[PDB]
Design an enzyme around this catalytic site. Structure first.
Site, PDB file in Angstrom:
ATOM      1  CE  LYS A 130      -2.310   1.103   3.322  1.00  6.90           C
ATOM      2  NZ  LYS A 130      -1.062   2.860   3.470  1.00  6.90           N
ATOM      3  CE  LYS A 184       4.867   1.100  -2.728  1.00  6.64           C
ATOM      4  NZ  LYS A 184       4.073   1.408  -1.489  1.00  6.64           N
ATOM      5  CE  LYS A 229       5.822  10.488  -2.054  1.00  9.55           C
ATOM      6  NZ  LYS A 229       6.798  10.329  -2.502  1.00  9.55           N
ATOM      7  CG  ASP A 280      -2.388   2.437  -2.725  1.00  8.13           C
ATOM      8  OD1 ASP A 280      -2.483   1.687  -1.422  1.00  8.13           O
ATOM      9  OD2 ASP A 280      -1.646   2.555  -3.461  1.00  8.13           O
TER      10      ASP A 280
HETATM   11  N1  ADP Z   1      11.951   1.271   7.779  1.00 11.81           N
HETATM   12  C1  ADP Z   1      11.776   3.015   8.008  1.00 11.81           C
HETATM   13  N2  ADP Z   1      11.878   4.076   9.551  1.00 11.81           N
HETATM   14  C2  ADP Z   1      11.722   4.827   9.603  1.00 11.81           C
HETATM   15  N3  ADP Z   1      11.401   5.748   8.484  1.00 11.81           N
HETATM   16  C3  ADP Z   1      10.762   4.785   7.745  1.00 11.81           C
HETATM   17  C4  ADP Z   1      11.309   3.188   7.408  1.00 11.81           C
HETATM   18  N4  ADP Z   1      11.153   2.756   5.880  1.00 11.81           N
HETATM   19  C5  ADP Z   1       9.854   4.196   5.577  1.00 11.81           C
HETATM   20  N5  ADP Z   1      10.335   4.437   6.517  1.00 11.81           N
HETATM   21  C6  ADP Z   1       9.838   5.624   5.683  1.00 11.81           C
HETATM   22  O1  ADP Z   1       8.521   6.080   5.443  1.00 11.81           O
HETATM   23  C7  ADP Z   1       7.777   7.175   4.355  1.00 11.81           C
HETATM   24  C8  ADP Z   1       6.995   6.527   3.300  1.00 11.81           C
HETATM   25  O2  ADP Z   1       7.985   5.546   2.901  1.00 11.81           O
HETATM   26  P1  ADP Z   1       8.098   5.209   0.856  1.00 11.81           P
HETATM   27  O3  ADP Z   1       9.135   3.556   1.196  1.00 11.81           O
HETATM   28  O4  ADP Z   1       8.210   6.194   0.093  1.00 11.81           O
HETATM   29  O5  ADP Z   1       6.729   4.462   1.155  1.00 11.81           O
HETATM   30  P2  ADP Z   1       5.939   3.889   0.195  1.00 11.81           P
HETATM   31  O6  ADP Z   1       7.129   3.999  -1.946  1.00 11.81           O
HETATM   32  O7  ADP Z   1       5.302   2.514   0.508  1.00 11.81           O
HETATM   33  O8  ADP Z   1       4.811   5.037  -1.021  1.00 11.81           O
HETATM   34  C9  ADP Z   1       8.908   8.014   3.797  1.00 11.81           C
HETATM   35  O9  ADP Z   1       8.821   8.872   5.022  1.00 11.81           O
HETATM   36  C10 ADP Z   1      10.255   6.627   4.467  1.00 11.81           C
HETATM   37  O10 ADP Z   1      11.116   7.685   5.100  1.00 11.81           O
HETATM   38 MG    MG Z   2       7.671   5.213  -3.487  1.00 12.93          MG
END
Ligand code: ADP
Ligand code: MG
Ligand code: ADP
Ligand code: SF4
Ligand code: SF4
Ligand code: MG
Lengths: 283, 283
Positions: A10, A15, A41, A129
Site C-alpha cells: 500500500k 516500498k 509518485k 492500493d
Molecule cells: N524502516 C523505516 N524507518 C523509518 N522511516 C521509514 C522506514 N521505512 C520507510 N520510512 C519512511 O516512511 C515514508 C514512506 O516510505 P516510502 O518508501 O516512500 O513508501 P512507499 O514507497 O511505499 O509509498 C518515508 O517518509 C520513509 O522515509
Molecule cells: Mg514509493
C-alpha cells in the site's frame, strides 16, 4: 541469469525506502541491479541518484515525440553502486488510467534490451492500493517472477498484501509469477513480527525480514541517500544487508493462499495489535 | 436541499472511521444522511449497520441477474440514527478496473431515486490513492459538490490530498465540484496541526478539524460501532460532533491551488515533522 522481482504494498508503507536500501546493499555485495519505478509518485530512484527524483519515460517521450524515439542510453541513469534507475511516470490525476505509464515503460525497456545478460536483479517498485491496469501488468504479463510485499500490522497494509496475493493466484495458470515473501516495515508495536509471520504462514510464504522503524532513515533521505550510503556503520544499514542476504538466498516462491477478512481480523485480535496503548520502545 | 459530499484520502488514513463517526454525529443532530461506499475494501458502512460489512451492489446484481433488476428498497440498509448505507463493491484484484463498481452504484442510486428530497447529506467514501476510473467519477461527473480530504503529516497523505486537488481543478470548467476542507487525522506528532493548516492555506482551503488519535476508536470498532454510539460521553465523540458542526456551517468551497512536491517537502521541513524523535504525548 537475472531475477525479476517486484516490491508491492500500500501507499506510504515503505516500498521505495526498502527497495532502494535493499538494492544499495545488493550493489555493495557486487550485484548488478536495475530499479524500475512503477508508482506515479515517481520518487522510487531519488536515493540512488542523489536527486530530487528522475524525469519519467512519459515526460521524456512527450519531449522527444514518441516513446520509440527515446534512446535507452539517454533514459537509464546510474547512481550509487552502479545501480541503474528508470521511472515510468503516469497521467495527471483525473485522466485515463493511473497505471498506463507502467505498461509503456516496461515494454520500452524490454524492446530496447535494458535486460542486459549481466544484470543480477531487476526490482519493480509498484503501487499496490489497486491491482488493475499497469499496476497489475507485472503480474498479469509475467514480468516479475518474485513478488515481495512490504506490509505492517496495519489492517490496510495486510488487506493490500492479501489483494496482491489474489492477483498472483488469478494469473497462476500461465507464466511463473510467485509470492516470495512479506517484508514487515515496523510500526514499533508489540507482537507485530509474530502477526506478519502468522499472516505469511496463512498465505503459504515467509516473513523474509522484519525492518525496524529507525529515524536514521529520515536523516539519510533528507540528504537524498540510502542508509547504506549515508552511514554504512548504522544499525539500520545491517538490517537492509540482512534483508538483501535473505532475498539472494530465497528459494521459496509459492502460489499463495489468500485469506478472508474474517482471518485478517482474527490475526489482528490474536496478536492484540488493536489493544496496544503505546509503542514497544517509547521514543 | 441536500449537500453531496465526498471523503477522499489515501488508504488507511481514516476515511471510513471519520465518515461514519461524522455521519453518526449528524444523525444525532437530526440530519438525514446516506453513506455510499466507493472503496473496494467495502467496510465503509459496518459501524452504522452493527455488521461485518454490507453486501455490495456488484454482489447483489450478480445474484439478481442485472443491476437494473435490483430494488433500491432491497439495496439500501438503515442503521444507527436512521443513516442509510450502500456499498459499491468492485472487481476482484487483477481484473478490469478496481473503480468500475463505483460507476455502476452511483448511476443505479440516481436512476432509482435514492436521492430523496428529505436527505440532508450524502457522503461518498472514496479510495484516493489513484484518481482515475470510478474513483475519479464523483469529481469528473459532478456527483459530489463538497470534497473533504482526510490526511495527516505523512508525505503520502499530503501527496494524495494534492492529487485529489489536481483532479478537482481538471474538471472545474463544468459542474460545481469544490474542495471544502482538509481533515487532519492525528499521528500524535508535534506541529502536525500547524502543518495541515499550512497545507490547507497553500491549497486555498482550511483545516476543517484536527481529529485526535484516540484508542477509544479501536474499542468502539471491535464492537462494530461509531464512538458516537459506543460512548456518547467520550472525549472523541465531542471531537466528531465538532467536525460535524463545522461541516454543517462550512461555506468555503474553492477551486484549489495544487502545490509542487518542492512545496510539500518545504512544509514537512518547516514544521520539523521528519526530525521529531517521539510522539507529542507518549502513551
Ligand atoms: N524502516 C523505516 N524507518 C523509518 N522511516 C521509514 C522506514 N521505512 C520507510 N520510512 C519512511 O516512511 C515514508 C514512506 O516510505 P516510502 O518508501 O516512500 O513508501 P512507499 O514507497 O511505499 O509509498 C518515508 O517518509 C520513509 O522515509
Ligand atoms: Mg514509493
Ligand atoms: N482518530 C482515530 N484514532 C484512532 N484510530 C483511528 C482513528 N481514525 C482511524 N483510526 C483507525 O485507523 C484505521 C484505518 O481507518 P479507516 O477509516 O478504516 O481508513 P480508510 O477508510 O481511509 O482506509 C482503523 O484501524 C481505524 O480504527
Ligand atoms: S482504478 Fe485507475 S483507471 Fe481503473
Ligand atoms: S489504475 Fe485501476 S484500471 Fe486504471
Ligand atoms: Mg475505508
Amino acid at each position: 541469469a537475472m531475477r525479476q522481482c517486484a516490491i508491492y504494498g500500500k501507499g506510504g508503507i515503505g516500498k521505495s525506502t526498502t527497495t532502494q536500501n535493499l538494492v544499495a546493499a545488493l550493489a555493495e555485495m557486487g550485484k548488478k541491479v536495475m530499479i524500475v519505478g512503477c508508482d506515479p509518485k515517481a520518487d522510487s530512484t531519488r536515493l540512488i541518484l542523489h536527486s530530487k527524483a528522475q524525469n519519467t519515460i512519459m515526460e521524456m517521450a512527450a519531449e522527444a515525440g514518441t516513446v520509440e524515439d527515446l534512446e535507452l542510453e539517454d533514459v537509464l541513469k546510474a547512481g550509487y553502486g552502479g545501480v541503474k534507475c528508470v521511472e515510468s511516470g503516469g497521467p495527471e490525476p483525473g485522466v485515463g488510467c493511473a497505471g498506463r505509464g507502467v505498461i509503456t515503460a516496461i515494454n520500452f525497456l524490454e524492446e530496447e534490451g535494458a535486460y542486459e545478460d549481466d544484470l543480477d536483479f531487476v526490482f519493480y517498485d509498484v503501487l499496490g492500493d489497486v491491482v488493475c491496469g499497469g499496476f497489475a501488468m507485472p503480474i498479469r504479463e509475467n514480468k516479475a517472477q518474485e513478488i515481495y510485499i512490504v506490509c505492517s500490522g496495519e489492517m490496510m497494509a495486510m488487506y493490500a498484501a492479501n489483494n496482491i496475493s489474489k492477483g498472483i493466484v488469478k494469473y497462476a495458470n500461465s507464466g511463473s509469477v510467485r509470492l516470495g515473501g512479506l517484508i514487515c516495515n515496523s510500526r514499533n508495536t508489540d507482537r507485530e513480527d509474530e502477526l506478519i509471520i502468522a499472516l505469511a504462514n496463512k498465505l503459504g510464504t515467509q516473513m523474509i525480514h522484519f525492518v525496524p522503524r529507525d529515524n536514521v532513515v529520515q536523516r539519510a533521505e533528507i540528504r537524498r541517500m540510502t542508509v547504506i550510503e549515508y552511514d554504512p556503520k548504522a544499525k539500520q544499514a545491517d538490517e537492509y544487508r540482512a534483508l538483501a542476504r535473505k532475498v539472494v538466498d530465497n528459494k521459496l516462491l509459492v502460489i499463495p493462499n489468500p485469506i478472508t477478512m474474517d482471518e485478517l481480523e482474527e490475526l489482528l485480535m490474536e496478536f492484540g495489535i488493536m489493544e496496544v496503548e503505546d509503542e514497544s520502545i517509547v521514543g
